[PDB]
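Work Package 3 (structural annotation) set out to generate three-dimensional models for the target panel prioritized at the project kickoff. During this period the team completed the workflow that converts sequence records into discrete structure tokens, so that structures can be stored uniformly alongside our sequence database. As a representative example, we reproduce one entry of 343 residues exactly as it appears in the project archive.
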Amino acid sequence: LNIKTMIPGVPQIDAESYILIDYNSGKVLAEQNADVRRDPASLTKMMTSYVIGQAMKAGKFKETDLVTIGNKGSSLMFLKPGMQVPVSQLIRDINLQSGNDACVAMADFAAGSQDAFVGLMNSYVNALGLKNTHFQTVHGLDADGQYSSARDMALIGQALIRDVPNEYSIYKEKEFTFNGIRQLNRNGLLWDNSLNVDGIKTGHTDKAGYNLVASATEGQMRLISAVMGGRTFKGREAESKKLLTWGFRFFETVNPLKVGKEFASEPVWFGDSDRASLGVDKDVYLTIPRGRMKDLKASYVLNSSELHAPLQKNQVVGTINFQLDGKTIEQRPLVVLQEIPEG
């Protein structure tokens, strides 16, 4: 009992707010001040990249398309007017280097104007159900009022990975060439040999402190951490590494039932067949203490005493309950997997 039922202590995190979630289940493994509104500084570019990823996924444009820069000269850091740059290069400037010029150029290219691009950003905020995030600019600079939170930023990270995988794949690139010049990925954790980190966005600003949204995997398990208002330079990577490491040590993500697989069969009355195949219409992912998988139990309850046809595909006919130590930890609709017409 005592060791199988212990709640692990959480490491001290030297930051104003953080959260650690599992990418597949959405389970929150740990949190402190995760909903407090803070300035995300350049984490904003994570949403910029999300919008761009969605546009490219919809086929609005492709990586090979050329973008013409429009309306500093002493720094090869600013994009010069008239300059033509492939989308492939601009999006890496944003994702790897958090380049400000690239954000503006891509905003105009994808949405016509920066303000219209910001509207799209805030539309996605609402589509993702984020309650503590609002944007003013596409780069997070002349926007003293932009805000997000540890939870919301983790959720944006989750959406990037989930909704636009082709955009997310770029984040693990350690290096790229912007017009003949080699540039590094600013996310130092990519070089950490201890974890398998492949994202996402690190930023710092005097006003907002250190900020990082990171994602790492171990096997098929993936965690996302957002640490905001990091207090010191030496903790900028270390604090999230500690959190991710702890997550992998004490928790495990299981996939007890896949979509379309038969969890159970039940007799059907008045139908074209006498047996209904029952399961789920969305994959089930559960995050439980590591080493408890064998104790996980599943059962179901039907809505009615008997099933009668007709039954539509994905029709809800009951509840599947997942439990551990007698605690129901997850409940899902139990659905009919194959249509059964009246007959």
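The longest strand covers residues 196-205.
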